[PDB]
């Protein structure tokens, strides 16, 4: 009943998105990224990166302008649809580690983000005459990955959003966030704050003061995971689920940060026992890393759902 997210797009020479959509246990898949954000990026149109994938072309503003906004992404566009006829979510993710430059400058332009990405990503509709980077397909939410620059605007998209999938009510659509694990998180814990998100994944890798393996030793730092079920309580996001964010191999994250199935085993025991209404699972970064890391004949998110479902 517990869910298995994992991140996709920017694995070194990765596997097409379809072959995961093949992977019995994964429950979301969130492709990333949508790492150009409009008030700096060329055109002010959006942009992305999905590593290996995808042909190379951008699209151009109406005025000529080249923006960063890949135009061919075939495989994506053939392979989304794999993943939701076997009924897994497909969230867009905004942000990502790279660059390290981009933020949200004004509400404006905050609404205006969310609205392209909706006209984009979202439903076709007829008063759309902008770009449709996966064609005719529609993703099923967006993910907030922010890693760089602070906190602003993002309440305001997530609203924007909401506002948006509460017009198409035959559809539920899903929001999400991946802050890491410092709290206040300075990139999100404003929004998580000021808007209601489905899913949280906190990122327990690379902060040594609070990662899952100081769960396991507990000398390293203390392992927050009850913090953020308390900083819940008082925000928008109340009713979110929050998800154990993992390293899928030994070098997917900083070293030190990796957990053995069987340690993952001792940590979800306890906080699945003890939060059985917010513990939403887990997540994984990232695909390519979990396939390459094999144990016992399966990829480390096969282990992962066993854990979940034990």
């Given at each position: 009943f517990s869910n298995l997210a994992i991140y996709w797009g920017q694995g070194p020479n990765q596997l097409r998105l379809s072959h995961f959509c093949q992977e019995?246990?994964?429950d979301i898949i969130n492709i990333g990224f949508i790492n150009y954000f409009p008030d700096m990026s060329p055109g002010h149109w959006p942009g992305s990166n999905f590593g290996?994938?995808?042909?190379?072309s951008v699209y151009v503003t109406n005025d000529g302008v080249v923006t960063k906004l890949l135009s061919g992404c075939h495989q994506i566009m053939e392979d989304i649809p794999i993943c939701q006829a076997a009924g897994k979510k497909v969230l867009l993710s905004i942000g990502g580690a790279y660059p390290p430059d981009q933020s949200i400058l004004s509400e404006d332009s905050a609404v205006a983000f969310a609205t392209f990405l909706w006209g984009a990503f979202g439903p076709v509709a007829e008063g759309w005459e902008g770009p449709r980077p996966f064609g005719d397909v529609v993703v099923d939410g967006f993910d907030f990955d922010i890693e760089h620059?602070?906190?602003?605007g993002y309440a305001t998209m997530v609203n924007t959003f909401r506002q948006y999938f509460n017009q198409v009510p035959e559809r539920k659509f899903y929001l999400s966030a991946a802050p890491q694990c410092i709290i206040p998180d300075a990139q999100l814990s404003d929004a998580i704050f000021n808007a209601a998100f489905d899913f949280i994944w906190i990122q327990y890798y690379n902060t040594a003061a609070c990662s899952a393996k100081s769960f396991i030793d507990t000398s390293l730092g203390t392992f927050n995971f009850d913090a953020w079920v308390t900083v819940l309580k008082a925000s928008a996001s109340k009713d979110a689920k929050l998800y154990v964010g993992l390293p899928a191999s030994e070098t997917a994250a900083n070293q030190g940060y990796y957990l053995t199935p069987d340690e993952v085993e001792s940590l979800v025991s306890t906080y699945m026992d003890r939060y059985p209404d917010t513990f939403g699972g887990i997540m994984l970064w990232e695909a390519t890393a979990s396939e390459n890391n094999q144990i016992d004949g399966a990829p480390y998110a096969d282990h992962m759902k066993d854990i979940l479902l034990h």
């Open positions: 019995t246990s994964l290996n994938q995808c042909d190379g620059n602070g906190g602003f």
